[PDB]
Amino acid sequence: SGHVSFAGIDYPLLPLNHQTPLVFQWFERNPDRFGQNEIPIINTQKNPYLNNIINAAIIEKERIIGIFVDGDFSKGQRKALGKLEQNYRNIKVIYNSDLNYSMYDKKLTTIYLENITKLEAQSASERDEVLLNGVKKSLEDVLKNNPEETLISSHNKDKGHLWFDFYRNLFLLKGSDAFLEAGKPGCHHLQPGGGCIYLDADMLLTDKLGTLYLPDGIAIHVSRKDNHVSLENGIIAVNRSEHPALIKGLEIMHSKPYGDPYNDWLSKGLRHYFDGSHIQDYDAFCDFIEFKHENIIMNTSSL
Numbered sequence: 001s002g003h004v005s006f007a008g009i010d011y012p013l014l015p016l017n018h019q020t021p022l023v024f025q026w027f028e029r030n031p032d033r034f035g036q037n038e039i040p041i042i043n044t045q046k047n048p049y050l051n052n053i054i055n056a057a058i059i060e061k062e063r064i065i066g067i068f069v070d071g072d073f074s075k076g077q078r079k080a081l082g083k084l085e086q087n088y089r090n091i092k093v094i095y096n097s098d099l100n101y102s103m104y105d106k107k108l109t110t111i112y113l114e115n116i117t118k119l120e121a122q123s124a125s126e127r128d129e130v131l132l133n134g135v136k137k138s139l140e141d142v143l144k145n146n147p148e149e150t151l152i153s154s155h156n157k158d159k160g161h162l163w164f165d166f167y168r169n170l171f172l173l174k175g176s177d178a179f180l181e182a183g184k185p186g187c188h189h190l191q192p193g194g195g196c197i198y199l200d201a202d203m204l205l206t207d208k209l210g211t212l213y214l215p216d217g218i219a220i221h222v223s224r225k226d227n228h229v230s231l232e233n234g235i236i237a238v239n240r241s242e243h244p245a246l247i248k249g250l251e252i253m254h255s256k257p258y259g260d261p262y263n264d265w266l267s268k269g270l271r272h273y274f275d276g277s278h279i280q281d282y283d284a285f286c287d288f289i290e291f292k293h294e295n296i297i298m299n300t301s302s303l
Ligand SMILES: O=c1ccn([C@@H]2O[C@H](COP(=O)(O)OP(=O)(O)O)[C@@H](O)[C@H]2O)c(=O)[nH]1
Pocket: 024, 025, 026, 027, 028, 029, 164, 199, 200, 201, 202, 234, 299, 301, 302
């Protein structure tokens, strides 16, 4: 079609053409279980992840493919990627530390003390003292722990999947202009404030994706088994840098103590923006936001 309507509001279908880079990501806690001249991306039998991107990149030799990486990498491991970039020159390895996220950041001192004030400003007979006293101990712990400690800094490598699911959302905010910001070669063909298509390393290209159309230029993976529909972070495709729906999620992250990239940033951001007042069902959003492609065997890690 040319559009789709949700919550009574109308939403045009927006193009994501074959310029639009595929993004994969690998945040690796333990680089030293790799060879120091091995590509520090996993290719195990159960998770032959280094293999899934290459085949992706081969199936799409004429759209850019980004590999969003992060971890304390040996010089030789960085040149394993280097070989990977010249041996296949649509692949672009991008180090998380080579991007500046200061414009999207916030201090937990700030974030906590905000909520402390909000709660203290409410009636004592209404208010969440149980929460009121948790944010203050969180407060008490960050002061001692470090004063200048932030949202971004918190979702660190020590923190498990939050480490990479948080920075994912940031990446997409920066979109295709991030190929430029790290300085990656042969990316002049990317359009400015242009989108991207993140993919779990396990979503399998089989055939070409071509030119995608989306409601407002955004869609995410939705899983449906056996009957339990959820939103998934394992595909995220936007048509531009700093898409609003994710922007709203970054605000919720700013305005919530203990925000979660999955619960708050991804899920509620999308849906509040698409459905601020919850007039359509959850599922009826899941359907509306679902990313459909027959040429990808979705989320093969479940097998
Ligand atoms: O050590 C890890 C583990 C996972 N991931 C990211 O998590 C995505 C999906 O993980 P997977 O399908 O293995 O786990 P699931 O979420 O499906 O259990 C991967 O493509 C990676 O981008 C990562 O960066 N480092």
